[PDB]
Subunit: 156 residues, 4 copies
């Protein structure tokens, strides 16, 4: 049924594997998923964010492996924004994965075939996602999902 398949990130269920093997669009939040969740503001009007290098490679593998990559506000940049893309790309909801970190992402993660919460996501989001990563946001959590998707699709 839905027992454990070993990965280098720890075991996953067959349910998760059957979910990830249908995925063709990966939707990613910025703050708390690709970034540490911090915005580095300065007195001189600066605003910085920190993104992880291992993530950008994970995104490139997925992109060249046939997984589109969208950054909810190169790749393609609430409830309705998700619907505009899936129609614009003609992708079915079962075929979408979503990585978020805040409770304000739940209405979209409720429609996607594979909802993902980063390890240090908002506590109220963790029981809702199909999968909770082992890596924190901005620390390679997106790479973790990217690797698991390619594994589930026999591409890695």
């Amino acid at each position: 049924a839905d027992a454990q398949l070993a990965t280098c990130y720890g075991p996953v269920s067959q349910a998760f594997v059957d979910r990830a093997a249908k995925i063709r669009l990966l939707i990613l939040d910025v703050d708390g998923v690709l970034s540490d969740g911090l915005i580095y503001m300065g007195n001189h009007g600066e605003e910085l964010k920190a993104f992880n290098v291992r993530d950008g490679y994970g995104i490139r593998c997925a992109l060249t492996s046939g997984i589109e990559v969208a950054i909810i506000t190169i790749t393609h940049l609430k409830l309705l924004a998700f619907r505009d893309l899936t129609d614009k790309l003609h992708v079915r909801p079962e075929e979408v994965a979503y990585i978020g970190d805040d409770l304000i992402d739940w209405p979209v993660m409720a429609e996607v075939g594979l909802s993902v919460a980063v390890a240090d996501a908002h506590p109220l989001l963790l029981p809702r996602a199909n999968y909770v990563t082992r890596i924190n946001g901005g620390r390679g959590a997106v790479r973790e999902v990217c690797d698991l998707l390619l594994l589930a699709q026999g591409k890695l």
Copy 2:
């Protein structure tokens, strides 16, 4: 009496719940509560701080839920500064919450209905606060309090 009520952050006492259910003004330090406690100084005269994105949403929920938000030196920006606001807003001390991280905040946290110390606050502050968060400063500790206040007030 004052037994445990489960939350997604861990249990809290009924005492804490009875405290948080009266709160209408949340007072927040900057350094070590909304920031990592670090100031990023550069050779070219820059000074930066890092604030957490999950916190800003927690502040917005509280603000739209009827909790004012003040940043001890949009929102409203020692012992006397606290008294000027509470008079200016006509709020009673029992109805104020305070999140700090340093021992130099104790005289104000001693007057408020709900004193809060962040998880990694100064060690000498932790035994004094009504509540110690589970999240570090600049990592979502303010969001933790914001969520607990809305829960205690039946707004979440």
Copy 3:
């Protein structure tokens, strides 16, 4: 003899207390003691460091409590640099504390009455110091020492 005295940072020996109660000059490295040990370099020629706000208050308490504060390269800014100050301030070596993080600090920490290694100092430095802090560098380790010195001197 030299048994344990409880502090809010954990126990210390009477030896440490008898050491800290003679201290009138605290010497502090920058990198890895007041900073996270990181230098934030940018393409546009920037160089940044991150210092902790709880540390600056610890330094101010010590300064107003009668402990001078020197930053080995407001306060007063290898083996010989230490000797120039102690002569210039007429302070005796038994009366000096030193917080470092790297093995290149050992010849000076060998002469001071109270040698201190931060919790995440270079592994080869930890067995050498009179005291190892509980807080990492750039995370309040200097505040920890500052508080312990004032306690040992009955000023806190």
Copy 4:
């Protein structure tokens, strides 16, 4: 045979010691080995990285101890880039050490006498390296290797 030799970083095998005692060229990735793996991008076109101060000293010891230091894209700056240097420096592969953090480094770490993965390297890289550090990238992992190499060569 290949039993444990105590170090201040924890035990290492004699195999590792026999490996490190032949090393004359240390090759280092940037992202995730000397840096936290983060790139700090700002709205105003900035890009920053954070390097560790304890690492730069480790590199200087190695350099003055007879270990060249190369930064795969002062020191000397995929599979073919490695081969160009080893020919240009007339160094034999058994005599090269490589510190990486991502699976895209494995073809080079497969040819070197001492392959090293940082503690928080990509999970798929850890079973491949001759050695896994105890320190994370950008936190002194390069210093750890630098110290172990000098120990293995009787220079420390």
